[PDB]
Amino acid sequence: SMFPSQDPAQPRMPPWIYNESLVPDAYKKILETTMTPTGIDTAKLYPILMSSGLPRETLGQIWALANRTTPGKLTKEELYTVLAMIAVTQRGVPAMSPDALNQFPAAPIPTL
Numbered sequence: 001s002m003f004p005s006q007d008p009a010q011p012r013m014p015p016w017i018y019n020e021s022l023v024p025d026a027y028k029k030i031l032e033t034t035m036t037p038t039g040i041d042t043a044k045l046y047p048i049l050m051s052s053g054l055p056r057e058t059l060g061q062i063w064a065l066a067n068r069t070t071p072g073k074l075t076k077e078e079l080y081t082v083l084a085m086i087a088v089t090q091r092g093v094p095a096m097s098p099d100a101l102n103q104f105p106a107a108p109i110p111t112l
Contacts, residue, residue, distance in 0.1 A: 001105065013067070013098070016107045017080045026083045026109040027076065033112060040074040052112055054089055062086055065095065086110040 034044035064070045066078035087108035
């Protein structure tokens, strides 16, 4: 997918996060799920995911761990960061570091 090259400007983050070429079904799903016509809405994300068996603690953290824009409005790519960490959490894999996202060739879709 992506190999490492010493470019002193290019980010070396997970390929699937910044792939703006296609938007995931998980995202359009999330529109139906918790999102609004006005964009991201964690408000519904809490009860649904906590009902999915996920912690309202981790759920809030997951919204907030958007690269390094915690108080920032989640953009589509940042919403890939949330989707994937939710997916891995459901799979019993906690979010420990960006290195762990690096270990996934492909990002899972959250089951809801």
